[PDB]
Design a protein around this ligand. Structure first.
Ligand code: HEM
Length: 366
């Protein structure tokens, strides 16, 4: 749909399809994201139940509807300030040895003759690192893996209620069971004026928000570097940092995000009435030719690279520095372990928002 995308960007970067409004241009998708005032993220009834939550009135509810993600300032900023430095430069500088050692061990388990790197490398790494960071017992990998499906970006589909409930019952219990044996990060949350529910949500957010996305970043990277035969250049020119930024732009783990107009607003040449949901196509903004010359091309050394794969504005991905650091250590250690990589088989996860692979079978020559 990147062609329809290029088409619409030219003719209708802010279009209405009957039900929802969609924004495909870079200038306008960025505008939406940065103007939280007109385009609110208060889409799960958090702002409406804050008081009753803090009142103790609301006692039970799906905890995931109350996290910084689905909230506007000040609430958002108050919640966010509690973990603002969790992925700070020095902190990441220090996890480096852990991340690299961890990726190297994961690589050590790969059978070059033929293996799936999604299963052996892409999935575990982020989970293992976030547990370390959050202080949540890693001996619960198989479960963290399952609950990672609950990430907000993913939307619903028929007959999933019983499955989701089950994952939800276990996930919550796990959190409840570990709320006090975690790092400063969670303690601060646990020891705040947040309701019991919001703390639950806050904790689940930090736990699962970057698993599937970071995994996808790693998978999509391996794919693009391979299909575009850039492994040699990347190693030679050391374009790891730049190439992962291009992978993010070209192959975004999250294709889009959503907002709701908190009022009647004119975006470009259109007037989006109050209360309208607005689809922000991150994938399309990333291809915007006005901003990204030769956007249809994968330029491994593209610089600069102002993509919106982590968003923009106040909700700009909290884990961005971490996702970047993890994918880059994974891509480097992977690239130094094989002479040549051959994609033998793939399986793509089915979702219009989440974009990556369920399976990535390859053959490596050490
Ligand atoms: C490379 C993979 C990743 C991608 C592409 C991604 C993408 C995004 C995007 C698009 C947003 C903004 C959503 C919006 O504006 O509605 C976001 C928010 C967020 N991300 Fe990620 N993410 C990734 C990795 C991570 C990691 C590793 C973590 C770590 C736990 C994480 C934590 C968060 C949090 C907490 C927010 C909400 C912050 C706020 O609302 O201010 N993300 N992410």
């Amino acid at each position: 749909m990147y062609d329809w995308f290029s088409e619409m960007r030219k003719k209708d970067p802010v279009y209405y399809d009957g039900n929802i409004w969609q924004v495909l241009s870079y200038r306008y998708t960025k505008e939406v994201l940065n103007n939280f005032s007109k385009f609110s993220s208060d889409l799960t009834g958090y702002h409406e139940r804050l008081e009753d939550l803090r009142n103790g009135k609301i006692r039970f509810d799906i905890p995931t509807r109350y996290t910084m993600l689905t909230s506007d300032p000040p609430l958002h900023d108050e919640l966010r300030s509690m973990s603002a430095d969790i992925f700070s430069p020095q902190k990441l500088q220090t996890l480096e040895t852990f991340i690299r050692e961890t990726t190297r061990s994961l690589l050590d388990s790969i059978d070059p003759r033929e293996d799936d790197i999604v299963k052996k490398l892409a999935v575990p790494l982020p989970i293992i690192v976030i547990s370390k960071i959050l202080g949540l017992p890693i001996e619960d990998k198989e479960k963290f893996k399952e609950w990672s499906d609950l990430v907000a970006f993913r939307l619903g589909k028929p007959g999933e209620i019983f499955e989701l409930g089950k994952k939800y019952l276990e996930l919550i219990g796990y959190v409840k069971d570990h709320l006090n044996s975690g790092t400063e990060v969670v303690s601060r949350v646990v020891n705040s004026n947040l309701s019991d529910i919001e703390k639950l949500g806050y904790i689940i957010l930090l736990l699962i928000a970057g698993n599937e996305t970071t995994t996808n970043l790693i998978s999509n990277s391996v794919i693009d570097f391979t299909r575009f035969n850039l492994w040699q250049r990347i190693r030679e020119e050391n374009l790891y940092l730049k190439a992962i930024e291009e992978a993010l732009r070209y192959s975004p783990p999250v294709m889009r995000t959503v907002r709701k107009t908190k009022e009647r607003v004119k975006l470009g040449d259109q007037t989006i009435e109050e209360g309208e949901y607005v689809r922000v196509w991150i994938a399309s903004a990333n291809r915007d030719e006005e901003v990204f010359h030769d956007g249809e091309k994968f330029i491994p050394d593209r610089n600069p690279n102002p993509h919106l794969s982590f968003g923009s504005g106040i909700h700009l991905c909290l884990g961005a520095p971490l996702a970047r650091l993890e994918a880059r250590i994974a891509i480097e250690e992977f690239s130094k372990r094989f002479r040549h990589i051959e994609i033998l088989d793939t399986e793509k996860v089915p979702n219009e928002v989440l974009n990556g692979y369920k399976r990535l079978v390859v053959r490596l020559k050490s």
